[PDB]
């Protein structure tokens, strides 16, 4: 595998251990051509990607359309300035170009709390509260896209904890593709008035 987790504008390095050709494909889409090197870059895959060789691909200037499975494959016949038919391929490094969920604390008898998760390109997101509790009053508005193209998923809860925050109210966010779970503590603040 390479970089299962990345961030916008950053780079990924993928290691392929045996001319090697990198071929990408979105979750559900058609196969696309990235480039190949013999130990040539496509029209749209030039001035932004560097191929070097073991063979590694250094993609830079990450974008939310970059989520794909950057397979590893070779070419049957050596080609100069062109491509060939990929004979044997390699395991897909699910380089999930995903801004892992970035939780934030939404500060406040009954009061409404929550945490706003943004920059979540892949749709799958799950929100939990207090390791599973308060099942009556847990909303998780499904999602919405942004101008850049990263989903904004925000959950909001209401809990009348005797007009004071005593229990450890922590929003448990889980995101399988990002392989990172953040349970940020939320409580009344000394500032950040609402």
């Amino acid at each position: 595998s390479g970089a299962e987790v990345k961030k916008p504008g950053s780079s990924v390095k993928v290691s392929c251990r045996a001319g090697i050709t990198w071929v990408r494909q979105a979750p559900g889409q058609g196969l696309e051509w990235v480039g190949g090197i013999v130990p040539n870059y496509a029209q749209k895959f030039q001035d932004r990607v560097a191929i070097t060789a073991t063979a590694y691909m250094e993609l830079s200037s990450l974008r939310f359309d970059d989520t794909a499975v950057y397979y590893c494959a070779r070419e049957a016949d050596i080609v100069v300035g062109g491509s060939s038919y990929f004979d044997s391929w390699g395991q897909g490094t699910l380089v999930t170009v995903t801004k892992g969920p970035s939780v934030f604390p939404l500060a406040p008898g009954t009061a409404a709390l929550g945490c706003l998760v943004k920059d979540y390109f892949p749709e799958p997101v799950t929100v939990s509260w207090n390791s599973g509790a308060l099942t009556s009053g847990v909303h998780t508005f499904p999602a919405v896209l942004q101008s850049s193209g990263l989903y904004s998923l925000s959950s909001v809860v209401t809990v009348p904890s005797s007009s004071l925050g005593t229990q450890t109210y922590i929003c448990n966010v889980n995101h399988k593709p990002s392989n990172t779970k953040v349970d940020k503590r939320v409580e009344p603040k000394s500032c950040d008035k609402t």
Partner: peptide, 11 residues
């Protein structure tokens, strides 16, 4: 029931 959330201190 209406209210607002200006997330800050990490944004």
């Amino acid at each position: 029931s209406v209210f607002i959330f200006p997330p800050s201190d990490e944004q």
